[PDB]
Scaffold this active site. Structure first.
Site, PDB file in Angstrom:
ATOM      1  N   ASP A 118       0.890  -2.809   4.293  1.00 19.85           N
ATOM      2  CA  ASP A 118       1.923  -1.882   4.681  1.00 19.85           C
ATOM      3  C   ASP A 118       3.158  -2.663   5.124  1.00 19.85           C
ATOM      4  OD1 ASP A 118       0.469   0.566   4.212  1.00 19.85           O
ATOM      5  OD2 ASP A 118      -0.205   0.649   6.380  1.00 19.85           O
ATOM      6  N   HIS A 172       1.553  10.602  -0.979  1.00 14.29           N
ATOM      7  CA  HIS A 172       0.638  10.038  -0.001  1.00 14.29           C
ATOM      8  C   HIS A 172      -0.256  11.211   0.378  1.00 14.29           C
ATOM      9  CE1 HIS A 172      -0.671   7.689   3.678  1.00 14.29           C
ATOM     10  NE2 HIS A 172      -1.142   8.904   3.903  1.00 14.29           N
ATOM     11  N   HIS A 185       0.847  -1.174   0.000  1.00 10.75           N
ATOM     12  CA  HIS A 185       0.000   0.000   0.000  1.00 10.75           C
ATOM     13  C   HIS A 185       0.895   1.241   0.000  1.00 10.75           C
ATOM     14  CE1 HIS A 185      -1.901   3.030   2.848  1.00 10.75           C
ATOM     15  NE2 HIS A 185      -2.575   3.194   1.723  1.00 10.75           N
ATOM     16  N   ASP A 186       0.515   2.209  -0.829  1.00 11.70           N
ATOM     17  CA  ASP A 186       1.335   3.395  -1.058  1.00 11.70           C
ATOM     18  C   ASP A 186       2.808   3.060  -1.214  1.00 11.70           C
ATOM     19  OD1 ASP A 186      -0.333   5.525  -1.396  1.00 11.70           O
ATOM     20  OD2 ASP A 186      -0.625   5.855   0.777  1.00 11.70           O
ATOM     21  N   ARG A 200      -0.099   6.125  -5.866  1.00  8.77           N
ATOM     22  CA  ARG A 200      -1.029   7.224  -5.779  1.00  8.77           C
ATOM     23  C   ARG A 200      -0.223   8.475  -6.173  1.00  8.77           C
ATOM     24  NH1 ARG A 200      -5.460   5.217  -1.244  1.00  8.77           N
ATOM     25  NH2 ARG A 200      -5.038   2.961  -1.615  1.00  8.77           N
TER      26      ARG A 200
END
Length: 304
Positions: A280, A79, A29-30, A66
């Protein structure tokens, strides 16, 4: 030996006749936030410590990119408001490098607008991505450009498959690549048809959940995947959760609990279908505890 023993090329050991949807895929994630060093900021804005190449070496095949349009020809990795110190090209170049080194892997790259464009920008985010990256001769051959809504590993290996979180697009290949895009419900578990009805996307993305509710929402979707052998169904399940709570608890702190709890659940399920589980601190190990990335990889069943 276990597939999780060779994370750098685990996909190369599967039946390439599998639809990507049917593969249990670890995601980060990210993904790009490993560049963050500011400790005050990192509590809530940092989600990874491995760089992209090291995440790939570790078996991550789904990347949550993102972005923010920061010039009419440039997307910066973000982010939310926080700039992550590089542009999308850097991700692409690393992906392209990794894929030529390991050409029987595929990467799914999710692309989302995470913040308002810089004030000089005169083009939409989707147009900039389409013209300056997807269609850019510089990245010729890197992206999946097939017309199949449900591609197999054979037709995607060596390439990046777009997972479209931009909205409607004129791009025609990848998940949600059409003029509707993907209807994403905020902080929710939901289900929506994508690719002109061809696929049913099932998502758990309750990113503001407190701990117990998050674990319960990850397991609820996990339990669904296990019962579902339908290839036209796609599961995306984010274990990642937003910072906050009793002290001012970091995204790391939560990952240190959730990752082992889900790793263990999956391990106890043996070879059950999991869907694409987005985490994460992908690759971050804690002596004594099952590793989420490793268990996602090992949950794949080799039948060939």
């Amino acid at each position: 030996d276990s597939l999780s023993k060779s994370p750098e090329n685990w996909m190369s050991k599967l039946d390439d006749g599998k639809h990507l949807t049917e593969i249990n895929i670890p995601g980060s994630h990210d993904s790009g936030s490993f560049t963050l060093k500011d400790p005050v900021k990192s509590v809530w804005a940092k989600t990874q410590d491995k760089d992209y190449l090291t995440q790939m070496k570790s078996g991550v095949r789904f990347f949550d990119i993102r972005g923010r349009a920061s010039a009419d020809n440039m997307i910066s990795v973000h982010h939310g408001m926080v700039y992550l110190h590089h542009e999308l090209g850097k991700f692409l170049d690393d992906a392209k490098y990794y894929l030529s080194a390991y050409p029987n892997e595929t990467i799914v790259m999710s692309m989302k607008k995470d913040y308002d464009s810089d004030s000089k920008v005169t083009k939409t985010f989707e147009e900039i991505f389409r013209e300056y990256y997807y269609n850019n001769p510089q990245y010729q051959n890197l992206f999946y450009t097939g017309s199949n809504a449900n591609p197999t590993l054979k037709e995607t290996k060596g390439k990046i498959v777009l997972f479209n979180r931009m909205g409607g697009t004129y791009i025609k290949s990848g998940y949600g690549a059409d003029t509707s895009g993907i209807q994403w419900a905020d902080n929710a578990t939901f289900e929506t048809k994508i690719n002109n009805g061809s696929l049913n996307l099932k998502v758990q993305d309750e990113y503001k959940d407190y701990y117990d509710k998050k674990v319960e929402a990850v397991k609820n979707l996990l339990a669904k995947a296990k019962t579902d052998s339908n290839k036209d169904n796609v599961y995306v399940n984010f274990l990642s959760v937003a910072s906050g709570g009793s002290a001012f608890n970091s995204t790391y702190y939560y990952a240190s609990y959730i990752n082992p709890e889900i790793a263990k659940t999956i391990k106890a399920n043996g070879k059950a279908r999991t869907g694409w589980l987005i985490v994460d601190y992908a690759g971050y190990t804690w002596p004594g505890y099952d590793d989420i990335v490793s268990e996602i990889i090992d949950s794949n069943k080799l039948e060939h």
